[PDB]
Amino acid sequence: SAWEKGMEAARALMDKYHVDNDLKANFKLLPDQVEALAAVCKTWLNEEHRGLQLTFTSNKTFVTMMGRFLQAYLQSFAEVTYKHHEPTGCALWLHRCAEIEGELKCLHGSIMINKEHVIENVVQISNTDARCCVHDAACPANQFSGKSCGMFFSEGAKAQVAFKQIKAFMQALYPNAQTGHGHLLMPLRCECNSKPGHAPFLGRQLPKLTPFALSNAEDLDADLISDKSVLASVHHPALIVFQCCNPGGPNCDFKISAPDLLNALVMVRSLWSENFTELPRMVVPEFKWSTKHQYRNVSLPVAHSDARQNPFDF
Ligand SMILES: [Zn+2]
Ligand SMILES: [Zn+2]
């Protein structure tokens, strides 16, 4: 059986990396069973990469993600699969966000509309470079629609840097490669929508894409360096950071940067290679827009105080 083939591999890794006997014991190739895999990733990491540096991500998240990556390899190699149970929990977004200067596109594949954020002594916060989902060009300041991809940006330029960063970061890693480093390896689910059979929840249905500034302290050095991977963040002091779907209802502490995310994948490939002869062909789904992703907003009409007793005049 394929299952057995999977069990064999999973088992090797597990004994070799001394995973808690309990985990081992209660392990089948069940889709929801990622723990056991994370532990493998956890110990190995340790042993072969202690003091790993993570930019804007948490350890749980990283290991966890490594866990899914393992799970995919495991599954592919064994040739087992579970319908509606994609392992990686990520997709490949062909963001055409670094093609036109000052131009960003949202998940819809549509260019993001620019809109200023003021409208009102007071404490007026201005956002002249904000960008929104075409389907939100009508909504008030940062309120998402029922068609929105839930993708918003308060600082277009920033966000473009981050996108540029990832691109340059990937080029660094993969200089010669028949493919335009236009894809963005992004997670489609966080802790909240981790399981297919999950309590539907309002708001953003995908992890939030948020660019974090690096500059802050990073602009305090540059010229010495030679390492392409380093140069990238330096020429583009901003990173793409994915958090919870909604950082009301549920909320998780999911946090991982694009690079750390791409690094978790790479790292799983090495771990696999240090244990298995050949690396199986692992396919991260291409991102395709769908309703499944549409922002779930609840729209309720709100009352307004009228100093009147009765609604109308007669
Ligand atoms: Zn959109
Ligand atoms: Zn979440």
How far is the centre of ligand 2, averaged over its atoms, from the C-alpha of 298 (Å)?
A: 19
How far is the centre of ligand 1, averaged over its atoms, from the C-alpha of 151 (Å)?
A: 6
* Ligand number nearest to the C-alpha of 188: 2
Rounded to an integer, what distance in angstroms lies between the CA atom of residue 114 and that of residue 280? 44
Residues 238/222, Cβ–Cβ less than 8 Å: no
C-alpha distances in angstroms, 295 versus 112, 135, 150, 288?
16, 11, 6, 15
Q: Is 133 annotated among the ligand-binding residues?
A: yes
- This structure's resolution (angstroms)? 2.7
How far is the centre of ligand 2, averaged over its atoms, from the C-alpha of 93 (Å)?
A: 20
How far is the centre of ligand 2, averaged over its atoms, from the C-alpha of 177 (Å)?
A: 34
Q: Is 148 exposed, middle or buried (0-12, 13-18, 19+ CB in 10 A)?
A: buried
Q: Is 97 annotated among the ligand-binding residues?
A: no
How far is the centre of ligand 1, averaged over its atoms, from the C-alpha of 232 (Å)?
A: 27
Within 13 Å, how many C-alpha atoms sit on residue 181's CB side? 17
Residues 32/89, Cβ–Cβ less than 8 Å: no
Rounded to an integer, what distance in angstroms lies between the CA atom of residue 239 and that of residue 245? 18
Q: Is 149 annotated among the ligand-binding residues?
A: yes
Selection from 144, 127, 124, 128 nearest residue 136 by Cα: 144
Q: Is 106 annotated among the ligand-binding residues?
A: yes
* Ligand number nearest to the C-alpha of 61: 2
* Ligand number nearest to the C-alpha of 151: 1
How far is the centre of ligand 2, averaged over its atoms, from the C-alpha of 242 (Å)?
A: 10
How far is the centre of ligand 1, averaged over its atoms, from the C-alpha of 235 (Å)?
A: 28
Q: Is 244 annotated among the ligand-binding residues?
A: yes
How far is the centre of ligand 1, averaged over its atoms, from the C-alpha of 103 (Å)?
A: 14
Q: Is 190 annotated among the ligand-binding residues?
A: yes
Structure-block tokens of residue 196: 């297919």
How far is the centre of ligand 1, averaged over its atoms, from the C-alpha of 55 (Å)?
A: 27
How far is the centre of ligand 2, averaged over its atoms, from the C-alpha of 192 (Å)?
A: 4
How many residues in total does the chain contain?
314
* Ligand number nearest to the C-alpha of 203: 2
* Ligand number nearest to the C-alpha of 252: 2
Q: Which domains does the chain have, with CATH numbers?
A: 1-88+259-285 (1.10.269.10), 89-258 (3.90.148.10)
